[PDB]
Design a protein around this nucleic acid. Structure first.
Ligand SMILES: [Mg+2]
Ligand SMILES: [Mg+2]
Ligand SMILES: [Mg+2]
Ligand SMILES: [Mg+2]
Ligand SMILES: [Mg+2]
Ligand SMILES: [Mg+2]
Ligand SMILES: [Mg+2]
Ligand SMILES: [Mg+2]
Ligand SMILES: [Mg+2]
Ligand SMILES: [Mg+2]
Ligand SMILES: [Mg+2]
Ligand SMILES: [Mg+2]
Ligand SMILES: [Mg+2]
Ligand SMILES: [Mg+2]
Ligand SMILES: [Mg+2]
Ligand SMILES: [Mg+2]
Ligand SMILES: [Mg+2]
Ligand SMILES: [Mg+2]
Ligand code: NA
Ligand code: NA
Ligand code: NA
Lengths: 53, 123, 80, 50, 54, 120, 53
RNA sequence: AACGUGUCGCGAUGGAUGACUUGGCUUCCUAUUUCGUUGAAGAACGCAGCAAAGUGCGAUAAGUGGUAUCAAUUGCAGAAUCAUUGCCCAAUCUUUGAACGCAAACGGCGCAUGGGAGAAGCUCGAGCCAUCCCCGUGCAUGCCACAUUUCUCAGUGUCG
RNA sequence: AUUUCGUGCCAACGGCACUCGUACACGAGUUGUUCGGUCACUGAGCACAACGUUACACCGUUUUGUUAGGAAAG
RNA sequence: AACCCUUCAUGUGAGUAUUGAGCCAAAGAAGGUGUCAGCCCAUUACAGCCACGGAGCCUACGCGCCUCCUCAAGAGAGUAGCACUGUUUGGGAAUGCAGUGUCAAGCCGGCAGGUAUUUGUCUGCCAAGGUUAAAUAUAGAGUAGGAAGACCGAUAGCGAACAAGUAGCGUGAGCGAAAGUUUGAAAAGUACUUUGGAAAGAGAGUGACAUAGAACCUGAAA
RNA sequence: AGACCUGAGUGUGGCAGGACCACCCGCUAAACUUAAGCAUAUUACUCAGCGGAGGAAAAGAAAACAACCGUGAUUCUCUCAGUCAGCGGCGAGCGAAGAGGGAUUCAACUCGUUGCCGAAUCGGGUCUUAUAUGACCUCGAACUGUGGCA
């Protein structure tokens, strides 16, 4: 039930990054998936390592 | 882990802080769940979830206690939220009160006083 | 051509799912349910089908609130 | 086709998740009576429409 | 005087007033072993009467 | 109070008993030495207790109680076991009415029970 | 009083090469077309049902 | 001769019979005995470490709280009075439904009021934050009483 | 309504066959300021409100410029 | 221990069974436990003992204090009645009711008194406003408990002893099953060798019994 | 300009709808069937349809029976009684009441009207530990009559 604007603000609060685009889809099993592109000043690989991926 | 006896004394600000730390710790556990975890790390998810529910229980009760005290006066008696009023069945809330059901007229009062019940026995 | 050939001429649909009961009985064109009579406030109940009545009556579902209030009555609304 | 309401899409999603076998560890429980999922569905046998 | 003689398996207790035929003739067959207390024995003349005595 | 004139009702109450009821139903007699000391006929069994089996294939065997499998109405005793085909060792269940208690794991709550049941 | 008689069975009539007993309606149940309502039928009503008076 | 027929011993196919029974049916009795706008009954969607159905529960989601008892639960994990178990006072209670802001094969669209976030801009990292976005509450129709410090009106109705 | 994709698999199924498969198993896949719909139009039509009728609304009227004996504009 | 003889073997689950001694009973009561149990377990009682209890109900109409309170007229009007029509009743020259028309009395009143009319007595009541426990129903309802049965015993008894108003069928209103997981006391649910791609076969092993091997007690007929 | 009457808008506090429906109360209302045919009759003032409650409902305190040496609200039970009561193509069929023995029962009350009074009544606000059957105030309702005594 979340929308794009709420997702973008939640990401910054949780991980302290700035984004440039959010794309969403609803999966066939009912879940919602989001692709989030970070700004060039932020490294997605560095953030994923901090997350624990 | 938390104990309900310790959460009782803490203030609202302290309880709200402890809620945020528990929610953050739960989020990290879900991330590891997507990867391979191990049995020990898979446990304590229920422990964190239980602790969150205990903090919310204390927070809600304190709020409801404050509202009851605020409206604890005969002045308002109608601004009180319906959820705070005593809930019985729908029929019991409309039936008749104790004082309304036993009302007697002036003639009824005098007759009852003049001819009271007696206990007599025979022989 | 009224048999096998005519089965290939059936294209649309008369009924869809009902918002109040399910059951796939909501007439699309007439905008009413053939099972619960929605959007009429009263639902259907006929004594020429006691089998159908016993399928829908209370106790065939969850009774989410009735369980609570029945226990409160048994304990004469003990409080605090 | 392409069009379907989100409510209808959610109903189909629940039926997809139901179409799966019984876990192996369920059969080893004390006093078990379940051997296989009796409510399996195939898209060519039974329709269920929606 | 029943308390001592209850719990004894195979012993039946009865009251001289309200004698039961289903107990006196089990299965329809007559002739049952009956033990009489002295007080109950002396009451049989009054309860059932005699010949030429109601 | 499970036993009733209704056999159908008595059997339903026994086999659908909750966990706290099954604790009482799984009781064992005390030994002669314990009876002479505590003056109690029998007590419910618990883990870390010492028992001696009196009825069945294991007669005269002694051991310490390892588990109280209430879901299977049995107790597990160490050194009372069987070998599998692979060589693994598995415990064998024994009904609690076939054993007797020789040593009790004392506790402040268990001591309260013994004083409750003291006939003298 | 309702035992064995809670169906909507009726006779198929003559000309269908089957006996004239009432038969259960519907399809897809293995109960469809089965004999019903008779004291000789499986799941039917017994002869002279017992009463409490 | 082969095929075919018949009797006996053994073996298949099939699921009768007997013995079992936490189920049904029938009769009788006892209560601090009878739902809902303080949102019912029903209907949908979700929740377990491994969890399809069923059961319990509702984002506090196989449960939080109180109480009595005490060592279990168990398929494998895993934790070690506090669990489990029985009962019950305090709570939570998603989307709907009489369904009631307006609609509806739409997880759609408002008005009023109070909050929240804010990567533009402004002022001195901080404070104000426009557009956009999120959340709480109120807003159906009819009928009854009141305007208690006695609200605003309309009639070539009757007077003045 | 997952039949799509990859890997594996041949018990049952594809009236013969299978090493193949729309079969079985385990995991994956559907990205929008501009595309279609709603936002935001009227049509053949429908029927909430109001009124009337009916023992009983679960009935009738409701686009020929248009509701209602009709004070419906905030 | 299977056509007969010889050698060599292998075979009896769990004592609630039998026998002999006791003991309890204000308790002999019917459930569980590897076979038929008063004394292995749980139960079986007050001829009782503890904690909790916010509303309600009962008790010198329970018991104190303050406050309050107390000790000539008339009688139901579009009503009753009457006519016609319809329905209803055992009610028959009309039992009750409904519609329309007509429409009272109270200065010797009105209604009833089971055959119509007019007249006079006698008897009993006083319509057209309202409230009210107990003894009664529960003929397909509930919420919690209890008690049972000369009943059925898995094609029977509820459709349903089982994930049953489920699977499945129909555009829909609706229709609606089959199926005891009853192996064994206990999974001790067949390690290992050998042939086979696998499924399986031949040996070995567990178990009192494997012709008790997993939809596994018994296992009939065609 | 100001009253009264009639009628609107808004605000404050409340209530109705839906479910259950075995039993109970009010309406509406068949045919199969029997009559060896069938139309009045019967099935039946039943089934199906609509509305409304409770823990029970409904009834209930004489404009009642009787004709006696008189009973005394309602409900229910045995009986009266398948009736030498009665209705009916007088066919098929149908069909009660009073009395009598019981269950229950300290069971009974009061609006209007008549006579004597005439806001002594109600709502709201404040005080008394109190939304008191108390007190004070009230150009609020009520004299087109609320209350109290016989
Ligand atoms: Mg998109
Ligand atoms: Mg045709
Ligand atoms: Mg066509
Ligand atoms: Mg059409
Ligand atoms: Mg479709
Ligand atoms: Mg049957
Ligand atoms: Mg083939
Ligand atoms: Mg009345
Ligand atoms: Mg059956
Ligand atoms: Mg059946
Ligand atoms: Mg209603
Ligand atoms: Mg009700
Ligand atoms: Mg005829
Ligand atoms: Mg004939
Ligand atoms: Mg004819
Ligand atoms: Mg009444
Ligand atoms: Mg009749
Ligand atoms: Mg008056
Ligand atoms: Na139009
Ligand atoms: Na008249
Ligand atoms: Na009816």
């Amino acid at each position: 039930r979340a929308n794009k604007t709420e997702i973008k603000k939640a990401i910054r609060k949780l991980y302290q990054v700035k984004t440039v685009k959010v794309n969403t889809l609803i999966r066939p099993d009912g879940l919602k998936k989001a692709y989030i592109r970070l700004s060039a000043s932020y490294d997605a690989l560095d953030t994923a390592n901090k997350m624990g991926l | 882990i938390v104990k309900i006896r310790d959460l009782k004394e803490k203030g609202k600000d302290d309880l709200l802080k402890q809620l945020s730390e528990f929610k953050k710790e739960l989020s990290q556990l879900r991330v590891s769940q997507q990867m391979n975890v191990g049995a020990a790390r898979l446990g304590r998810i229920r422990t964190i979830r239980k602790g969150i529910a205990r903090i919310m229980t204390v927070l809600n009760k304190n709020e409801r206690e404050n509202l009851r005290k605020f409206y604890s006066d005969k002045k308002l008696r109608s601004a009180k939220p319906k959820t705070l009023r005593a809930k019985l069945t729908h029929r019991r809330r409309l039936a008749l009160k104790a004082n309304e059901k036993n009302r007697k007229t002036r003639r009824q009062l005098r007759m009852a006083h003049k001819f009271p019940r007696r206990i007599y026995a025979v022989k | 051509t009224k048999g096998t050939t005519s089965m290939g001429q059936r294209h649309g649909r008369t009924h869809i799912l009902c918002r109040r009961c399910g059951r796939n009985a909501y007439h699309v064109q007439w905008e009413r349910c053939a099972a619960c009579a929605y959007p009429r406030a009263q639902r259907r109940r006929y004594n020429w089908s006691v089998k159908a009545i016993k399928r829908r009556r209370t106790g065939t579902g969850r009774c989410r609130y009735l369980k609570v209030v029945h226990r409160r009555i048994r304990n004469h609304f003990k409080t605090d | 086709g392409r069009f379907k309401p989100l409510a209808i899409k959610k109903k189909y999603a629940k039926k997809l998740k139901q179409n799966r076998p019984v876990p192996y560890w369920i059969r080893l429980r004390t006093g078990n009576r379940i051997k296989w999922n009796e409510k399996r569905r195939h898209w060519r046998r039974t329709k269920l429409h929606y | 005087g029943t308390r001592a003689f209850r719990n004894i398996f195979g012993l039946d207790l009865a009251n001289v007033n309200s004698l039961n035929l289903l107990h006196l003739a089990p299965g329809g067959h007559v002739g049952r072993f009956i033990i009489w207390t002295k007080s109950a024995f002396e009451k049989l003349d009054k309860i059932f009467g005699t010949f030429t005595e109601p | 109070g499970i036993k009733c004139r209704n056999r159908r009702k008595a059997r339903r109450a026994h086999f659908q008993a909750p966990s706290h009821v099954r604790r009482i139903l799984m009781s064992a007699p005390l030994s002669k030495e314990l009876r002479a000391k505590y003056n109690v006929r029998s007590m419910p069994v618990r883990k870390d207790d010492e028992v001696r089996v009196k009825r069945g294939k294991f007669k005269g065997r002694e051991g310490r109680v390892t588990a109280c499998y209430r879901l299977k109405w049995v107790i597990h005793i160490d050194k009372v076991s069987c070998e599998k085909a692979n060589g693994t060792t598995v415990p064998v269940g024994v009904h609690t009415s076939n054993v007797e208690i020789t040593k009790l794991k004392l506790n402040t709550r268990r001591k309260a029970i013994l004083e409750r049941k003291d006939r003298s | 009083r309702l035992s064995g008689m809670k169906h909507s069975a009726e006779s198929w009539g003559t000309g269908r090469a089957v006996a004239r007993i009432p038969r259960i309606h519907g399809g897809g149940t293995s109960m469809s077309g089965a004999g019903a309502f008779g004291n000789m039928c499986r799941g039917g009503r017994m002869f002279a049902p017992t009463k409490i008076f």
